[PDB]
């Protein structure tokens, strides 16, 4: 990185103003005589004692243990921005009742308790309690600052320059900020995107965490610089409780974290808009996940193919290269679902076009890939070449759908295609136009097996301040770029996803990868950690970066396998395939100047280890798919920090060299050159863990030193779980999606286990519009394995059957009996290893759609 291209807090005049306000007695006080209480809200006026500016606090109790605090000017010169389209619904409220009152304080009960809120008039403060336990305080350090709108037209409060760029700043200083105190909390998480540790660091001695969607060339590690995406959600965890703070603001935001009986204080500082904050009171982390999903929605259910392996680079040269890469996978027995087309595929970076030299017959290329049951992804960026011969440009220019400067003309930056304009994705009509451009008639050469990648959607503007859009550019409704910046990317992602849905007549689920994102981006597809580097420490950081995303609802995360920049050594590439094989979005990608790194170009030992990784991923597709269905339905993260499953185990709170997939698999990928072992922490009092390769059983809690080879992927199955797999690995997921299942039952010390399985057609909305899916529950206890429906609304015509059952932690039975309605009782043959206590049941042969039971007789 060149840090001088990016503002430090001191270089951002509003951050400097806000951050200069130090802990003290707040000048804000509430005027209790103006207090009004309704069924849905409490309102009261606040005043700054010095300036006499009046503000309105709207305080609401909400269903599902949440509190909403909104602060705006009572008499604004011009309306302040309120973030649209992020919230999925108007949050259902809970009544606040006055249960206590004096001259300086009002105690409010939320519904019939146990939650309570204490409003203190002077100095203004809010305290949120559950019965007698104080959960959180607001403005406890007196850091609330609300810069009112002054008369339109000290250092840098108005016109402001950074390097060679000037911001005319017509409204002057309008920043808003507020602090929160979290007694008993020492560990805080979230606010992606930063190439930093999962457990967030105190900012006291340095820079605050920055949230401003930016394209940071050659980004570096373990620092708070703002990257491509911004999710203003902070989670706080202790042995006793979980809390979350969701700061609904789309403007440039800085977050200060400090500690001090242990307690963490958080301060948010935003350039514009209102103060709109949700306090999500848990008490468990799963309760916080639900609370947040109720506000912003859940992860969109990926089409199954998108959970397979993606092969990319900048750039596959032409149709021959794409077809040789496709054939390369098959000749080397390595599965792959998607081949990606970067910017060189288009006609001179004119999106929605094809270079006629390199790709003269796109439909024929797509047909060839469809015959291999594979897909393609094409890059479509939100910058349009200013060219009168380019129909997209002409239509957007003619309909005035571009982002504008203050003088009313179309903003022009320097970008991938030279002079380029930026469609205003904040405009609902622009998003409809964009969606309509994805019709097969409009996007010539596209087909149902062509999906999309949205890159440079921060927006990345090559000649712009910090490589982005001027703050004073103008958007829909007359809002400035500064007001909306962090949702630009989300809107691109939203419109692209709607385009893929619409082009199919609303039947097909979309697949869109986006670089930039905000709260709510989970609803539109996948995201990745951008332009990483081919180095061991970037391989390591993929875990904390994707975990920070998972915690805030973005379950479909990944990092470029092998690293984007530079050439990875073969050993690093292998370890990266192994890491990526156990992360949600699994794509190998590489910068323009790197050597070719398709996995069969390596020496045979490296190819073999990679093939092994790919087989493991493909076999686990039913498991991945079920975890994504659970995320879509409940809002629970797919990839999890260990502290999510072990909330009382304090030694797990900072772990970032391991993670869990659901509650069933614990992964400790090898992330060092020349490693011959890894220290694996296996938590849980009275928990057992099975090494999935050796079937060796280990009791928790322990730190195990596990030996590793080049092919090793340290993965442990938790006792008490059932993991479904497709053991017949084929060339792509479409090939496998009707195949029989093998159930891997890991017995708890009580001899029990459970797990679910979701199945549908693999790609349409038929699961939701027609209830065409299966949600099975597999449960084991005593000496019986049972399949029952976990959602009787779901019916599915499928040839999928149970071909095998593998039970870890079992004795040798005398007989195995299968019962299922419509069939006579069946006797299964079996194999047992007494050394490992592994029992393999042969060919149950029962439909996955049927209820059944398998009894083990002694």
């Amino acid at each position: 990185v060149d840090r001088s291209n990016f503002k430090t807090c001191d270089e951002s005049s509003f951050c400097k103003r806000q951050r200069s306000i130090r802990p003290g007695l707040s000048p804000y006080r509430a005027l209790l005589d103006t207090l009004q209480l309704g069924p849905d809200a409490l309102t009261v006026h606040l005043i700054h004692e010095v300036t006499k500016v009046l503000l309105v606090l709207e305080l609401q109790g909400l269903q599902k243990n949440m509190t909403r605090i909104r602060i705006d000017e009572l008499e604004p010169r011009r309306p302040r921005y309120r973030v649209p389209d992020v919230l999925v619904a108007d949050p259902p409220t809970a009544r606040l009742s006055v249960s206590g009152r004096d001259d300086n304080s009002v105690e409010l009960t939320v519904a019939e308790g146990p939650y309570k809120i204490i409003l203190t008039a002077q100095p203004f403060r809010l305290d949120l309690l559950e019965d007698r336990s104080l959960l959180l305080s607001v403005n406890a350090r007196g850091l609330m600052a609300f810069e009112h709108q002054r008369a339109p037209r000290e250092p840098g409060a108005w016109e402001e320059t950074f390097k060679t760029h000037s911001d005319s700043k017509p409204y002057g200083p309008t920043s808003v900020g507020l602090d929160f105190s979290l007694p008993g909390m020492e560990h805080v998480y979230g606010i992606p995107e930063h190439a930093d540790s999962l457990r967030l660091k105190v900012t006291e001695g340095g820079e605050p965490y920055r949230l401003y969607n930016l394209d940071v060339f050659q980004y570096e590690l373990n620092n708070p610089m703002a990257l491509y995406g911004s999710v203003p959600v902070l989670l706080a965890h202790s042995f006793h409780r979980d809390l979350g703070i969701f700061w609904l603001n789309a403007a440039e935001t800085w977050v200060d974290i400090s500690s001090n009986t242990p307690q963490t204080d958080i301060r948010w500082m935003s350039e514009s808009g209102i103060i709109d904050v949700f306090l999500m009171l848990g008490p468990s982390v799963f309760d916080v996940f639900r609370q947040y999903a109720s506000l912003t929605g859940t992860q969109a259910l990926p089409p199954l193919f998108s959970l397979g392996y993606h092969q990319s680079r900048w750039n596959y040269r032409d149709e021959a290269d794409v077809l040789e890469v496709d054939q390369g996978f098959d000749d080397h027995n390595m599965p792959c679902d998607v081949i990606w087309l970067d910017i060189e595929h288009a006609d001179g970076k004119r999106y929605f076009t094809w270079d006629p030299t390199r790709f003269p017959q796109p439909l024929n290329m797509l047909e060839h890939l469809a015959s291999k049951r594979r897909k393609l992804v094409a890059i479509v960026d939100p910058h349009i070449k200013v060219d009168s011969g380019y129909r997209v440009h002409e239509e957007l220019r003619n309909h005035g759908l571009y982002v504008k400067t203050r003088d009313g003309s179309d903003y022009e930056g320097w970008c991938w295609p030279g002079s380029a304009s930026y469609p205003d994705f904040t405009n609902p009509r622009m998003r409809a136009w964009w969606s309509n451009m994805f019709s097969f008639d409009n996007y010539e050469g596209s087909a149902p097996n062509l999906y999309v990648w949205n890159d440079m959607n921060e927006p990345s503007v090559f000649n712009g301040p910090e490589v982005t859009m001027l703050k004073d550019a103008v958007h829909y409704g007359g809002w400035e770029h500064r007001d909306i910046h962090n949702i630009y990317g989300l809107y691109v992602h939203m419109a692209t996803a709607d385009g893929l849905i619409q082009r199919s007549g609303g039947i097909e689920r979309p697949f869109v990868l986006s670089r930039a994102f905000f709260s709510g981006s989970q609803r539109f597809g996948a995201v990745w950690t951008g332009d990483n580097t081919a180095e061991w420490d970037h391989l390591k950081i993929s875990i904390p970066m994707c975990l920070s995303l998972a915690l805030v609802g973005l379950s479909f995360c990944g990092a470029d396998v092998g690293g984007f920049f530079k050439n990875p050594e073969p050993e690093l590439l292998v370890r990266w395939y192994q890491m990526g094989a156990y992360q949600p979005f699994f794509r190998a990608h590489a910068h323009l100047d790197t050597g070719r790194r398709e996995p069969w170009l390596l020496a045979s030992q490296y190819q073999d280890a990679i093939r092994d990784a790919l087989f493991q991923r493909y076999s686990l597709l039913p498991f991945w798919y079920t975890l994504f269905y659970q995320a879509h339905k409940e809002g629970f993260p797919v990839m999890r920090p260990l502290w999510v499953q072990y909330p009382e185990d304090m030694s797990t709170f900072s772990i970032e060299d391991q993670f869990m997939l659901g509650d069933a698999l614990l992964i400790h990928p090898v992330s060092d050159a020349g490693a011959h072992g890894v220290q694996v922490y296996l938590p849980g009092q009275e928990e057992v863990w099975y090494d999935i390769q050796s079937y060796q059983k280990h009791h928790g809690p322990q730190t195990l030193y596990l030996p590793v080879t080049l092919s090793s992927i340290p993965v442990f199955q938790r006792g008490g779980t059932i993991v479904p797999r497709w053991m017949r690995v084929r060339r792509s997921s479409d090939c496998m999606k009707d195949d029989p299942i093998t159930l891997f039952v890991a017995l708890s010390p009580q001899g029990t286990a459970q797990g679910e399985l979701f199945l549908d057609d693999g790609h349409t909305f038929n699961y939701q519009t027609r209830h065409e899916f299966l949600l099975r529950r597999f449960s084991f206890s005593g000496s019986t394995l049972v399949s029952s429906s976990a959602d009787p609304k779901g019916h599915l015509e499928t040839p999928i059957w149970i071909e095998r059952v593998v039970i870890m932690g079992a004795g040798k039975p005398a007989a195995v009996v299968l019962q299922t309605k419509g069939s006579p009782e069946s006797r299964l043959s079996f194999q047992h290893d007494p050394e490992t206590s592994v029992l393999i049941l042969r060919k149950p042969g029962v439909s996955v759609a049927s209820d059944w039971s398998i009894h083990l007789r002694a």
Binding site: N333, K372, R373, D734, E803, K843
Partner: protein, 88 residues
């Protein structure tokens, strides 16, 4: 009275199975020899007879995968992809 037929022995000698375990869509032999006609074994092979032309062997994982592997199309017999003979 009636003499019984002998069971099947895997080519690797690892087991002996009845003939209803040959091409029964479950892998019983470590060498994959009980499933030459199906996709059930991870190390099996399927023989493209390619009547009139050169015969080819393909991976068992390519039997009924919906992709045409054999020029005679015999690998796709119960998948929903109907393969044409492209052996010429």
């Amino acid at each position: 009275f009636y003499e019984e037929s002998k069971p099947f022995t895997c080519l690797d000698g690892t087991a002996t199975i009845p003939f209803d375990q040959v091409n029964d869509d479950y892998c019983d032999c470590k060498d994959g020899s009980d499933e030459p006609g199906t996709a059930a074994c991870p190390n099996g092979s399927f023989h493209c007879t390619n009547t009139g032309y050169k015969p080819l062997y393909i991976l068992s994982s390519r039997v009924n995968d919906g992709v045409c592997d054999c020029c005679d199309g015999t690998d796709e017999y119960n998948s929903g992809t109907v393969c044409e003979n492209t052996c010429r």
